Chains A and B, each alone.
Chain A
Amino acid sequence: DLAPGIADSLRHFKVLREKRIPPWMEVVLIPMTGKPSLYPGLFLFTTPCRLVRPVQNLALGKE
């Protein structure tokens, strides 16, 4: 019940560059469907060599 809030807080911190969260962080929250979907968990990646691309976050209005 707290994990979407933590994921949105980390995306907020990432796109606003607030709490030394890198702007290239992948905040993945794989949800618990109760079905044979992907293995759930809040996965956070900051390592290099990943592909990353700019979109615009419409809630914040920033890239």
Chain B
Amino acid sequence: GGLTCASAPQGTLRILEGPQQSLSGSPLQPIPASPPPQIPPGLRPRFCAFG
């Protein structure tokens, strides 16, 4: 138990978690565009001129 000074280390291992990327890199999934306003069907001339 003299606890002498040992030599300098050769290198460094570093352990850390890696993320999973099987999900991302996929084609994007955007929010679907709301439709442009379309005229309602069944619009008729309700007003007829008097006389």
Contact = CB atoms under 8 A, between A and B. Distances in A.
Interface residues of A, number: 9
B contact patch SS: loop
A5 B23 CA distance: 15
A49 to B, nearest CB: 29
A contact patch SS: loop
Interface residues of B, number: 8
Contacts of B30: 56, 58
Nearest to B27: A58
A60 interface: yes
Interface in A28-55: none
Interface of A: 5, 8-9, 12, 56, 58-61
